Amino acid sequence: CRIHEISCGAHSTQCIPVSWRCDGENDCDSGEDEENC
Amino acid sequence: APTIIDLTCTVATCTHSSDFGGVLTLTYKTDKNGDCSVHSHSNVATLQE
Ligand SMILES: [Ca+2]
């Protein structure tokens, strides 16, 4: 996606902005961003 | 910035009290995820977020 967006893993096509990483909410499909943080 | 099209509004419950006694839900269609700024253009009601 965009330079300022990170996808919720390769297995999913959804991409979210990097500001949502480790915000305390499961913004991904199954909370991939909140993992290993 | 995201583009929001075909946005219509509705209110679930309301109770005019000193707290934030009221919830409203917004429906829309967008192209990409992001964060938007939300504001009430009137004076009768004040938002929280
Ligand atoms: Ca998150």
Side-chain angles (χ1 to χ4, degrees):
Chain A
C1 270
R2 202 50 161 153
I3 186 165
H4 286 107
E5 295 184 311
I6 38 158
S7 183
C8 295
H11 277 252
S12 178
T13 77
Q14 156 208 19
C15 64
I16 53 178
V18 308
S19 185
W20 292 7
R21 185 82 162 271
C22 311
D23 48 20
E25 269 299 279
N26 34 30
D27 316 278
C28 280
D29 53 70
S30 46
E32 279 82 35
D33 63 352
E34 295 293 324
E35 295 294 324
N36 53 69
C37 196
Chain B
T3 192
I4 300 332
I5 68 201
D6 210 3
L7 156 80
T8 206
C9 156
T10 167
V11 153
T13 84
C14 187
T15 295
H16 60 91
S17 99
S18 268
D19 309 15
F20 293 87
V23 306
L24 64 85
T25 58
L26 297 198
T27 51
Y28 54 75
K29 294 203 291 323
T30 175
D31 50 20
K32 62 180 170 249
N33 315 315
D35 38 355
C36 274
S37 100
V38 47
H39 169 233
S40 148
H41 285 256
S42 169
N43 179 2
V44 167
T46 86
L47 280 192
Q48 171 171 64
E49 41 265 50

